[PDB]
Amino acid sequence: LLPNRPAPEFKGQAVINGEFKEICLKDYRGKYVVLFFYPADFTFVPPTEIIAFSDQVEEFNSRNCQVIACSTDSQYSHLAWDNLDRKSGGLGHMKIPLLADRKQEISKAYGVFDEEDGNAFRGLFIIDPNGILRQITINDKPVGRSVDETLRLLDAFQFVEK
Amino acid sequence: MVLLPNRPAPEFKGQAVINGEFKEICLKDYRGKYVVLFFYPADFTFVPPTEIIAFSDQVEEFNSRNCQVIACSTDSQYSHLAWDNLDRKSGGLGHMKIPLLADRKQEISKAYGVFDEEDGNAFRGLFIIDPNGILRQITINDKPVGRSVDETLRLLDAFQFVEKH
Amino acid sequence: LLPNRPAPEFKGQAVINGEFKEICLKDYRGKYVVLFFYPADFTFVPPTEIIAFSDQVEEFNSRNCQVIACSTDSQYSHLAWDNLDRKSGGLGHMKIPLLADRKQEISKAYGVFDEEDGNAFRGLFIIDPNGILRQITINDKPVGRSVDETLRLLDAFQFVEK
Amino acid sequence: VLLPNRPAPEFKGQAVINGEFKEICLKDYRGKYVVLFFYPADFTFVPPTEIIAFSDQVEEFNSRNCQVIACSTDSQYSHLAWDNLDRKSGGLGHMKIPLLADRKQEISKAYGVFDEEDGNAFRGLFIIDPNGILRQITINDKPVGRSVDETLRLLDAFQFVEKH
Amino acid sequence: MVLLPNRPAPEFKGQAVINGEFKEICLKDYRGKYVVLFFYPADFTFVPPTEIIAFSDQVEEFNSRNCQVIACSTDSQYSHLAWDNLDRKSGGLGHMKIPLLADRKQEISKAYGVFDEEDGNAFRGLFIIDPNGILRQITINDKPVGRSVDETLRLLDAFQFVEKH
Amino acid sequence: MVLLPNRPAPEFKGQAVINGEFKEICLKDYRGKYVVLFFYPADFTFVPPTEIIAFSDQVEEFNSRNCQVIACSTDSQYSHLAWDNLDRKSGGLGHMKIPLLADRKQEISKAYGVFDEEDGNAFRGLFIIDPNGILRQITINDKPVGRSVDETLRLLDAFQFVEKH
Amino acid sequence: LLPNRPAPEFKGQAVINGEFKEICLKDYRGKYVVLFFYPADFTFVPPTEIIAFSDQVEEFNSRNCQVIACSTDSQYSHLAWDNLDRKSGGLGHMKIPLLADRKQEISKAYGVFDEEDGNAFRGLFIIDPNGILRQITINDKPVGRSVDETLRLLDAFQFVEKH
Amino acid sequence: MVLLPNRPAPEFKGQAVINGEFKEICLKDYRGKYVVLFFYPADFTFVPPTEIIAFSDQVEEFNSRNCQVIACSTDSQYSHLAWDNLDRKSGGLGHMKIPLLADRKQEISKAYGVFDEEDGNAFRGLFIIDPNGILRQITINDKPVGRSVDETLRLLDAFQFVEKH
Amino acid sequence: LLPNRPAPEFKGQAVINGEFKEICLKDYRGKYVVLFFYPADFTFVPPTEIIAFSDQVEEFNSRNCQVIACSTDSQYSHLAWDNLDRKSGGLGHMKIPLLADRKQEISKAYGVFDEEDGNAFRGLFIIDPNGILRQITINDKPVGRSVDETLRLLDAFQFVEKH
Amino acid sequence: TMVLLPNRPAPEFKGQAVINGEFKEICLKDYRGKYVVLFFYPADFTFVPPTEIIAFSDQVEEFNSRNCQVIACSTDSQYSHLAWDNLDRKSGGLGHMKIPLLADRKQEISKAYGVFDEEDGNAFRGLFIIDPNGILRQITINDKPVGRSVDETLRLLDAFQFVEKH
């Protein structure tokens, strides 16, 4: 894995605002892509920083968009996190698709998923509009992803590409 | 392709959700007793999965021959508990005294031989084992069909009666 | 095995109402099937499996499901166990095809057979009109299966399909 | 590879002697010459029962060691149930000879017998010595029989030649 | 391992003899006639007899039944000629009117599966073949015993009766 | 493919450049403190790696919280010092107090999952590790960017924040 | 590396006199090449042998040869030793092609290389226009050969072709 | 392809005809003296060819020089015996004063490399060995041609002249 | 190897009547050839074995034949045995073809090639114009080859090939 | 195989040489504690025509005065070296040698050092120098139809001696 190449991308089903739509990277290219993984769902109190990405869409959208989220939790769990409200738990709602990744292949491609914990690590890899992977980053379990740095790397890449 | 009964039972490791607390479970952690390891594909569903809780409510009856009815999915633990917390009306199972297991690291499912590989889930089977760790019965179903508790009770009574008799 | 992939096609020599008939899997098609195993011929007293399906066969054919009784015993042996009478400790006159696996093929194909005892244990399989495996059941040597659940599985598979 | 003057393709199986069931091992008949003959199936379509002739000649065999070792690829139950039927009504009536079951087709695959194509064994008559060594091989495939006279003759010819 | 009947018979060709000739004589030469192939360990071996002459004098019985009797040893051609031309008294044969075959390079013996590794001579077996190039009957003995012509005639009668009648 | 930020780390030796001094800098010499290892493609490449030299001035901030700040180009040692010998304005590194490490033999680069095969190239490497041999975080961003000095402190403080409490 | 067999190919960054370039052996036909190897940049030696040779090139290039140079180091770095003053720690401004292999390709190709210090041993090869090198030479690290003798062996190879 | 000259000789074992009787002999039984061992394809003839009998009627030159040459062929013991008991004139060879070694199976001949694939007969050849079991000289010939006794007599004298004198 | 099979072909040059002349097995035919090997050039032991072969050529050619020698030595060594003199360490100007095997291949082919001392054994086999080898015989180090036996085997050979 | 490296141990060799007419087996091990110079050459009698490199052979004492044992090394046998050595320089042959005429008929040492030429079955020219610890300080292969220089070897030897103490 080096950050220049098309990514062994993915095939899957996702949750887009209540509706189930199966997506593949190829449905995107000609547009910038970014993909964040993040651990299993429905965990207790802790920040669930993923929601930060849903409300922050427009900032991502100045060029292109659709940061996705993969988990071994597949369909139903992602739908259940997408529907239920912030007060109780999970994403109050999301204008972004949550990936399936039930078969872990999406994870097994990208170099994530420490084998013994039954799930993946954190996210945020970047893919150019021609489908080439510009950036790789992985975080350990007890930490979150930063929203600002993704936009900084993204914009810097917009300036270096142009 | 598959494995034969009367052979030792396929070992498993995982953690599950008991009466609301947590429990590390291994085949070895519980055997004085015949067990029912019946599977089910995933957490939640669009559809009304009304066979879910059905095995759980009768377990006291299963325990008279020293037995227990366990369920498992390849979905995560937190997902199992969050599914446990829902109401029958709302489509979730009620609060049960039976655990529900999880692979996620692909352990319990791959041992017993159930998988579609496409849905990353179990093929919804039911196995029966003896207290000495050898497998009494294998059954596997398809996704939409369920297992019957009565037939399970018949299999249990017939298999339990033969041991020392 | 698994309830998805195509069924382990077989060519046996069966007993239909006394006469030898070579059958494929494919020749019996468009109406489900139950492929069921039993360990041996001339088992001491009980014909208490086998014939259980024969008296209940009306119920199986009304749902279109056929019934295949198999053993690793030969043709001739099946005819000889069939020709004996129930009172005398025999299958009596059988109105269902007795398959006769003969040598090792069909039993281990379907995945049961035996190592030490060279006989299948006890199977019950369900197949659909297009030849793919619907349901697998195996019990053990000493105990058997009940017919009602087989009928329930059949109806459950039929009502869900359309 | 199976030839004469070789250790015997040992077996066990379960058998039927005079109506009962006894697990037998070749070694129980050690110290004696053996004549092992195979027959394709139990309860065969073709009616003629003729093999029972070897059972009728057993006195002659008892005059010199052995036993007739009637094993076939058929199972235990088939041999016992065909044994329980009578010669008159067809099928082997009763026997002063050991009937062994090959079943899982261990012994047949051992001896070089057991035609794979119809899944039934061939005619397997062979002779062995008291030392567990194979003296004689014969096959004469299914649609024919073995002669008892030639077997006892072969035995007699075989007994006088080793010491002198 | 062992040769199964109803299976095609292993072909053989060589330099042997017939009545003092050294002709070809390959299995393919009959095809439509029964053959009986019987082995014997060596030339100039027992001396007398050895019992092979039993097959030599009654060949008419085989020929009226449509058959051919081939004798064979791992010994050379000239050796076969020298043992055949020799006299009954001195232990030489009776000038066989049937071809006795000599595999010097073996492989005729090893094909049919009769080869003694301990010595390097044959194990003295008896095979019967079909008119269609298919193997019918196999019999093998040990070194010191022998073979009977009557039983062979019995097998012939039975196989011809099943073939034609 | 790449490794994972959980299991231990691919230890290293090399020599160094620290304040002009080498001292061989073995991984084991760096125990007891968090480390941030950052890679860059070449020496005297000053046109794109502007600001990479700017990394030298904020290191105190890294050191007060107990950390290393060490880096490398996977290029030559003496070359790191000789590039370190010029002034920022004059087209030089000025003088950096960060340990500059150099694996001439491209070992460390291939270990960490960097080193683009076609041209000897560390893209831009950045790893974070805990005081004993374990890797906390990985990031690599292609050719052009110089990452950021600021965000790494956020990652460091957060990583200290979850274990400390 | 047999002298009677064709020479291992090379293409690379060049840094011809004063600036930069990209060069391959194949560009040279009817004219020789001299392949020069040497350890890393800016460490210690007043000649690397680069000085005695490159300053004396009038005799070396007149014989149809090139002599170039090669080391394992970054592209910019060869230019950087080229860029500094004769005194102090720089070589001076060298007029000659510098072959920069950071991927160790060319070094490991001619077989002059080691993974210990990741550098190359100082070698000298001579190459004919038909790709037949006729001579192989390698020294150790602390020692050089000489400016004169390489040229002597060279002359021996140059006068001999058709005569 | 050939064993090799000057190399130790390959062990061989078989049975032979000594003074009319049978003795299993190996070179190792002799050692201790120069040995010569030759070969011939088969045993018997209706025509005259002689060859080996030249060695047989006078062994004196060989026995006085400490040699004791052995004859060997691929054929049974009994065949060699049957050729040995006869008279030189009229079809048999003499009474051999050299041990006739009988390769029944494919071993001594195939070992020494004189085996002819085209049949079960060896090529006619002669090897010479020393008291220490090493081969001094290898010689062969095509089958239909022959061997010289005189030259065989000369080479021994040559070896006695060269190794010790 | 084995008789009656075609002989492994060989090519080489060495010394034929003092001059060179690279020769190949296939170019001859029409005559029996006897290829005889000899261990080394310029040996202490007396050469006279081979000398028997050099002076006796009339008879060698009279049998419809050609007698070539062989060594793991090069052409020039054979030249030094040729161009010097019969009397001291050389053998005439040879009326017999010697072999030029430098790379000791031909020795390895015929199955001789002593491995320990890198020298050949006695060689001397035989062939026919139809390209198949009739007879093999080899001695080892000290002893020599006999000419009389070559004449005897030849005489034995003519009656069998002609009749 | 093909490529030898300095600072690496030198491949050890054994063989039978010609010293002053006498044939005696020599081994690398006798030269420990001392520098050795192994110089190759394709064949006897051939090229460059004789004796050319004879320049190195007759003046050897000065080369011998500071360590540095010098070897001959050709694909020919001992006896051949003896016959080419016995002729006088004038007659087109190597003179009477005060240095080892060692060689390999068995292609042992030559194919080891990587100087063996397969096409002409003889080794190429060139040489190697070794240190008292059996380690290779120089490679320098040349070619068959050409020659060497004595000076490069003589000065380089002193430089290599200059590095061990200084």
Domains and CATH numbers, chain D: 1-164 (3.40.30.10)
Is D135 in Cβ contact with E139 (below 8 Å)? no
Q: What is the distance in angstroms between the Cα of B43 and the nearest Cα belonging to chain A?
A: 7
User: Which structural technique was applied?
Assistant: X-ray
Nearest chain C Cα to D91, which residue? C80
- Separation of alpha carbons F30 and F9, rounded Å: 12
Residue whose entry in the numeric block shows the structure tokens 């009319």: H20
Is A146 in Cβ contact with F137 (below 8 Å)? no
**Between E143, E145, E151, which is nearest D150 by CB?**
E151
Find which of G79, G102, G116 to mutate to test the F interface (most F CBs within 10 Å of its CB). Answer: G102
Residue whose entry in the numeric block shows the structure tokens 């006639």: E33
Say if strands C133-138 and B135-140 run parallel, antiparallel, or are unpaired. Answer: antiparallel
Nearest chain G Cα to J2, which residue? G1
Is H120 in Cβ contact with E74 (below 8 Å)? yes
DSSP state of F99: P
- Separation of alpha carbons J29 and J17, rounded Å: 15
Say if strands E125-129 and J22-27 run parallel, antiparallel, or are unpaired. Answer: unpaired
Nearest chain D Cα to C89, which residue? D81
Structure tokens at C159: 């009502």
Is B120 in Cβ contact with A104 (below 8 Å)? yes
The residues, ordered by sequence, that sit 6+ positions from I58 with a Cβ below 8 Å of its Cβ are none
- Separation of alpha carbons D40 and D74, rounded Å: 8
CB I40 within 8 A of CB I71: yes
**Between F43, F81, F120, which is nearest G103 by CB?**
F120
CB I129 within 8 A of CB I32: yes
Residue whose entry in the numeric block shows the structure tokens 């004589």: E25
Find which of B3, B4, B51, B152 to mutate to test the C interface (most C CBs within 10 Å of its CB). Answer: B4
Put simply, whether F118 touches A (Cβ < 8 Å) is: no
- Separation of alpha carbons F39 and F30, rounded Å: 17
Beta bridge partners of C15: C20, C98
The burial of J119, by beta-carbon neighbours within 10 Å (0-12 exposed, 13-18 middle, 19 or more buried), is given as exposed
Nearest chain F Cα to A7, which residue? F1
Annotated resolution, angstroms? 3.5
Is J122 in Cβ contact with I102 (below 8 Å)? yes
Q: Please, which chains are in contact with H (at least 3 CB pairs closer than 8 A)?
A: E, I
Beta bridge partners of F100: F71
Contacts of B118 in chain A (CB under 8 A): 103
> C touches D (3+ CB pairs < 8 Å)?
yes
> B touches E (3+ CB pairs < 8 Å)?
no
> C touches B (3+ CB pairs < 8 Å)?
yes
| Cα–Cα distance list, B87 to A76, A87, B53, D94 (Å) | 16, 18, 11, 71
The residues, ordered by sequence, that sit 6+ positions from B138 with a Cβ below 8 Å of its Cβ are B2, B3, B5, B125, B127, C136, C137, C138, C139
Is E142 in Cβ contact with D136 (below 8 Å)? yes
Say if strands D126-128 and D99-100 run parallel, antiparallel, or are unpaired. Answer: unpaired
CB H132 within 8 A of CB H126: no
Find which of A15, A22, A38, A74 to mutate to test the B interface (most B CBs within 10 Å of its CB). Answer: A74
Task: Tell me phi and psi for residue H92, to 5 degrees.
Answer: -145, 165
| Residues 67-106 (E) with a CB less than 8 A from some CB of H | 74-79, 81-83, 103-106
> A touches H (3+ CB pairs < 8 Å)?
no
Q: List the B22-26 sheet strands across, edge first.
A: B22-26, B13-17, B100-102, B71-73
| Cα–Cα distance list, G121 to D36, G35, G36, G116, H144 (Å) | 81, 13, 10, 11, 67
**Between C3, C114, C140, which is nearest B142 by CB?**
C3
Q: Dihedral (C-alpha) C98, C102, C104, C108: value to the nearest 10 degrees?
A: 0
Beta strand spans in G10-119 (E): 11-13, 22-24, 33-36, 70-71, 99-100
| Residues 40-69 (I) with a CB less than 8 A from some CB of J | 40-44
CB G138 within 8 A of CB G157: no
Please tell me the number of Cα atoms within 13 Å of A137 on its side-chain side: 25
Q: What is the distance in angstroms between the Cα of I18 and the nearest Cα belonging to chain H?
A: 32
- Quote the radius of gyration of chain F (alpha carbons, Å): 15
Q: Please, which chains are in contact with B (at least 3 CB pairs closer than 8 A)?
A: A, C
CA of residue H151 relative to chain centroid, distance: 15
- Which three-class secondary structure state does DSSP give residue C154? helix
Is A116 in Cβ contact with B76 (below 8 Å)? no
In total, the C-beta contacts within 8 angstroms joining chain H to chain I are 85
Residues H64-103: b if buried by 16+ CB within 10 A, e if exposed = eeebbbbbbbbbbbbbbbbbbebeeeeebbbebbbbbbbb
Q: Please, which chains are in contact with C (at least 3 CB pairs closer than 8 A)?
A: B, D
